[PDB]
């Protein structure tokens, strides 16, 4: 599924992400845009054997299990395949754990590079939320 910007903003709001660990809704929409271009099926293989999954590009070295990295961790206690669903719940629930780890949204590289220090509220402007 490729979400529309405003469609995703609404779904993220419904999932309680607005102001979650202090990050306004625009931050979350912007992160999805640059991490996955709003695509719930997005995957990216990394040099360590791990894979980034789904709309928020969550890494299998730490957060989910895909079997392909023996001794890796699964801190969200889910199969990585759950992060490729057309509904965002599993990704959002896992993302909540990630952002609560102690370094905020900096754990998302594309958020740091493309969202942090920008007018993130632009990503939700003009949506009827």
């Amino acid at each position: 599924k490729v979400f529309g910007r405003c469609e995703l903003a609404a779904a993220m709001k419904r999932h309680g992400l607005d102001n979650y660990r202090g990050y306004s809704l625009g931050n979350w929409v912007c992160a999805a845009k640059f991490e996955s271009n709003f695509n719930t099926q997005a995957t990216n293989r990394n040099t360590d054997g791990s894979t980034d999954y789904g709309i928020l590009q969550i890494n299998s070295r730490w957060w989910c299990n895909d079997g392909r990295t023996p001794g890796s961790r699964n801190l969200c206690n889910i199969p990585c395949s759950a992060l490729l669903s057309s509904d965002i719940t599993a990704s959002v629930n896992c993302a909540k754990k990630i952002v609560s780890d102690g370094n905020g949204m900096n754990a998302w590289v594309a958020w740091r590079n493309r969202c942090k220090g920008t007018d993130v509220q632009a990503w939700i402007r003009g949506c009827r939320l």
Partner: nanobody
Amino acid sequence: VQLVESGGGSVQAGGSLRLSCAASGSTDSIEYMTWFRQAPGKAREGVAALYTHTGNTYYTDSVKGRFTISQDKAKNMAYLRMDSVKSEDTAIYTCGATRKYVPVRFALDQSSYDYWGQGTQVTVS
């Protein structure tokens, strides 16, 4: 990513020594820069980790209060200042880094790190 260590060598007990690590390539993709050490008879252990995008720091119990990890992010530099050094600090010190986030609970584990410097001997008298 190449990590280039400098500093080290001999130091007296209760004294101070600064180690430096300079990171190759662009500043932006480095996540953690973290000093490890390996002492006579023991495995490599995490000493002090720094998350470069917030400045947050994490120390092993045996150095809390005596060692300080810090950075100059613009230069891809990380520093370890050892104050109040003790015999147990004698070890080979190596800086590691990652280009992907690592949960804080694993930030002092060597298996978390993908890039390493040379090792720099520190000896406490």
